[PDB]
């Protein structure tokens, strides 16, 4: 299968999660294209992919704000070709906050409204992702079994 991973990361935690997920998928034989949201054009972005994984950290002071580089893509998500596309979301946040990983919920809700097929509920990491390696690995295994 061919998967696309697009991540929005300010301090590199969601980028480290995206790289862990990319290796799990490549180790199982998938074809994997991993891109920073900062380098991406929304226009037909998901075209030709069997699975699309979107990663984004949460910002703002209990007023959800998406990671800076991901904003433009979220704004033009209606142009990516998400209708009928198998997708799943992930991101890093702080479980202590009002909207823990609220950017993962917001992205899932728009994808749902755009006709995408959410194959798995979003992976929401608390704290340092390097300490949540087994959950990341376990979530990537489950998405593979869900497509
Ligand atoms: C100023 C500020 C606001 C934040 N807002 C939230 C929030 O509303 N909810 C949440 O779950 N995490 C929030 N975070 C936590 C960050 O999303 C978290 O540190 C995450 O690991 C950052 O990931 P990144 O390095 O991929 O950009 C906030 C952090 C800062 C510094």
Number of helices in the DSSP assignment: 4
Might you state the CATH topology name? Rossmann fold
Number of domains: 1
| Helix fraction bin | 25-40%
Q: What is the makeup of the main sheet?
A: 6 strands, parallel
PDB class: electron transport
Keywords: electron transport, electron transfer, flavoprotein, mutant
Assembly: monomeric
Entry title: D95A hydroquinone flavodoxin mutant from D. vulgaris
Pick out its properties.
monomer; 147 residues; alpha/beta; Rossmann fold; six-stranded parallel β-sheet; two-stranded antiparallel sheet; 4 helices; 8 strands; 31% helix; binds flavin mononucleotide; electron transport; transport
Task: Explain the overall architecture.
The protein has helices at residues 13-27, 71-75, 102-113, 133-146; strands spanning 2-8, 31-36, 51-56, 58-59, 65-66, 86-93, 117-118, 123-126. It is an alpha/beta fold and 147 residues long. It has a single domain (1-147), classed as Rossmann fold. The strands form two sheets. Strands 1, 2, 3, 6, 7 and 8 form a six-stranded parallel beta sheet that branches. Strands 4-5 form a two-stranded antiparallel ribbon. The longest helix has 15 residues, at 13-27. The radius of gyration is 14 Å and the shape is globular. The protein starts with a strand and ends with a helix. It binds flavin mononucleotide (FMN). Residues 3-144 form the Flavodoxin-like domain. Its cofactor is FMN. This is Flavodoxin.
